[PDB]
């Protein structure tokens, strides 16, 4: 493996370099807004982000070492989490706003027009507010996002090989080392380092929560609104 031979600096640069671009939406400011169109805009956006995410995952150290089925499984589990933390990161310097795209900035009021959206929006806003208060760094964000990819699906040789599970955890440990390296580099004391580390990883629980709740509402409207084939298959993965 190469992921275990990388220094903390090399881990960061690799993750930074692998960063997907910020895509635009089809938002037409002239068009009358409707529930079906708003969800259409968000769905189309997510579907295009998914394509970049998949190729981003291949650039995450250790991910390519896994079997293809394990890769599929990890992405099926984490895709909405990864989209959400990305959204939350883009929205950090937009208090009270969610930056889905540079041309699609939204407040919670514009979410009331679909059942369940305002609840998700408030949770996402709270997360970006948390990141803003914490002064989350880009090098920390990319570490967090790759932890989600490797972690979110790992607890679901042998009858489903356990050798793979160990490699993932070794890589996870490396990303932990990388986070600590960054924090010490930022002049934090040992107590501050493990405190911030804890604060960061605990937010991942809420991100899981948002994904679970979001997924739940998403496969309830699958009620007309057009989902892309890839999105449809990712969504089916959280059922059977």
């Amino acid at each position: 493996s190469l992921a275990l031979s990388l220094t903390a600096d090399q881990m960061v640069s690799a993750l930074l370099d692998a960063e997907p671009p910020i895509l635009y939406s089809e938002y037409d400011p002239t068009r009358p807004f409707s529930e079906a169109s708003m969800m259409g805009l968000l769905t189309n956006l997510a579907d295009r982000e998914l394509v970049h995410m998949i190729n981003w995952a291949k650039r995450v150290p250790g991910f390519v070492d896994l079997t293809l089925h394990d890769q599929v499984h990890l992405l099926e589990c984490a895709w909405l989490e990864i989209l959400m933390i990305g959204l939350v990161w883009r929205s950090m310097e937009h208090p009270g706003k969610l930056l889905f795209a540079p041309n699609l900035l939204l407040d919670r009021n514009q979410g009331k027009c679909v059942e369940g959206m305002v609840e998700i929006f408030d949770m996402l806003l709270a997360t970006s507010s948390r990141f803003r208060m914490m002064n989350l760094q880009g090098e920390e964000f990319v570490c967090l996002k790759s932890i989600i990819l490797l972690n979110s699906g790992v607890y679901t040789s042998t009858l489903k090989s356990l050798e793979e599970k160990d490699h993932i955890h070794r890589v996870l440990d490396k990303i932990t080392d990388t986070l600590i390296h960054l924090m010490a580099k930022a002049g934090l004391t040992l107590q501050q380092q493990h405190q911030r580390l804890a604060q960061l990883l605990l937010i991942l629980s809420h991100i899981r929560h948002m994904s679970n709740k979001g997924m739940e509402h998403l496969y309830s409207m699958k009620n007309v609104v057009p989902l892309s084939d890839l999105l449809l298959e990712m969504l089916d993965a959280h059922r059977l």
Partner: peptide
């Protein structure tokens, strides 16, 4: 067999 599978495969 699976869109994600094919995409991961290329």
């Amino acid at each position: 067999h699976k869109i994600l599978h094919r995409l991961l495969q290329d």
